């Protein structure tokens, strides 16, 4: 019974809520209230070791206060999310990365890059662009869909293994 604390970040409308509920409750939600920010807990087994996951889903609006910086600092690893059919959501990735280091006092932080909505045929971001960005940052890249549950478990479990190489 070790514990892990994970955070999901990314532009509005990319699928942060839908990915989390898939992991916790195993069903899909066609739309969800974009203002609601919540935390969840689950017990899982990864490589034989039993452990508890806490997951923070972020929402609301852009604000910077000294309390929010403590609420976020608590997290041990982060999932950057973008949607494959939304080019602007892919450029925002840089902004999110720099804010994270500003509150973690380090260059080395466990992160994974998530390309969501792979069930839709109209790609506007090819797969090579995403691998080049990920190789520059030194982190893994995963493609997922939350409408079919393809890749959901893999994404979260990869982050957990990141947090272990750290220590």
């Amino acid at each position: 019974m070790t514990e892990y604390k994970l955070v999901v970040v990314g532009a509005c409308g990319v699928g942060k809520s839908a990915l989390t509920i898939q992991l916790i409750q195993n069903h899909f939600v066609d739309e969800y209230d974009p203002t609601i920010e919540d935390s969840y807990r689950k017990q899982v087994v990864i490589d034989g070791e039993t452990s508890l996951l806490d997951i923070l889903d972020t929402a609301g609006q852009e604000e910077y206060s000294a309390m929010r910086d403590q609420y976020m600092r608590t997290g041990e690893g982060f999932l950057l999310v973008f949607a494959i059919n939304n080019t602007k959501s892919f450029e925002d990735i840089h902004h999110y990365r720099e804010q994270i280091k500003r509150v973690k006092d380090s260059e080395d932080v466990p992160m994974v890059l998530v390309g969501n909505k792979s069930d839709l045929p109209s790609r506007t971001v090819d797969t090579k662009q995403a691998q080049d960005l990920a190789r520059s940052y030194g982190i893994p890249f995963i493609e997922t869909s939350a409408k079919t549950r393809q890749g959901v478990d893999d994404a979260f479990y990869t982050l957990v293994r990141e947090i272990r190489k750290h220590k």
Partner: antibody
Framework: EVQLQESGPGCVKPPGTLSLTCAVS?????????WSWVRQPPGKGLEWIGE???????NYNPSLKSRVTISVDKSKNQFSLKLSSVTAADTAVYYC???????????????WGQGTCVTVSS | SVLTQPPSASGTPGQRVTISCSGS????????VYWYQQLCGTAPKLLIY???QRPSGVPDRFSGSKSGTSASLAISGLRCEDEADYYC???????????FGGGTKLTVLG
């Protein structure tokens, strides 16, 4: 933010059973938090009644433990209270609250309802 | 009530005031203390958590302390904004429940 609104009958004849309901908005009943009932007799200090967790675990105040029951309804985003064998000593304002977060602990009562008043009389 | 508080306190504007709350080894001894403020006709509001930390929107005039089985709340630069009820709270390992103090009405003189 989460919003909490309690409802119930304002008057009860003894020896009936009091019933109360709290409806949750702006948040999910299935998050990692504990849901509490607290009461305040008129002109006196606060008293804690009990807790429930979304998977059905409960703690009760040892002095009331034999009269209290609390329950969760997943399908409506609500939780409720029953208190049997009421007497005049149970006249109070009742509040529903949320707290004890597993992410970052601020204590037992982060958010409060506006409260409701119950009078027990013949 | 299981924790003990003095029923009242008072002071003149601008001076400092102090409130106390006493308990036992099963509660204030072992665990953290939390403080709540209530204005007449409304629900309570958090004020100090985990002995001495302020949530967002609480001025720097409020500070808290814990020592042995006792706790304390200090207020400085007293103003009419502060006339309220105050409660301490803690968990109790012998009962498995949250316990409250009695409450303390603060009054502003002059």
């Amino acid at each position: 933010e989460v919003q909490l609104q309690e409802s119930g009958p304002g008057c009860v004849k003894p020896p009936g059973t009091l019933s109360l309901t709290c409806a949750v908005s702006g948040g999910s009943i299935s998050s990692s938090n504990w849901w509490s009932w607290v009461r305040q007799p008129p002109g006196k200090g606060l008293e804690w009644i009990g807790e429930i967790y979304h998977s059905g675990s409960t703690n009760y105040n040892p002095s009331l433990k034999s009269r209290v029951t609390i329950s969760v309804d997943k399908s409506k985003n609500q939780f409720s209270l029953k208190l049997s064998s009421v007497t005049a000593a149970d006249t109070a304002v009742y509040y529903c609250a949320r707290g004890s977060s597993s992410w970052y602990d601020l204590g037992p009562f982060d958010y409060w309802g506006q409260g409701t008043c119950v009078t027990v009389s013949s | 009530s299981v924790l003990t508080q003095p029923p009242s306190a008072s002071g003149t504007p601008g001076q400092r005031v102090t409130i106390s709350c006493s308990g036992s080894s099963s509660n204030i001894g072992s665990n953290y203390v939390y403080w709540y403020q209530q204005l007449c006709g409304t629900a309570p509001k958090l004020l100090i958590y985990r002995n001495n930390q302020r949530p967002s929107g609480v001025p720097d005039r409020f500070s808290g302390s814990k020592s042995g089985t006792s706790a304390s709340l200090a207020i400085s630069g007293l103003r009419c904004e502060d006339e309220a009820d105050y409660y301490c709270a803690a968990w109790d390992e012998r009962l498995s429940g949250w316990v409250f103090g009695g409450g303390t009405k603060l009054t502003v003189l002059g």
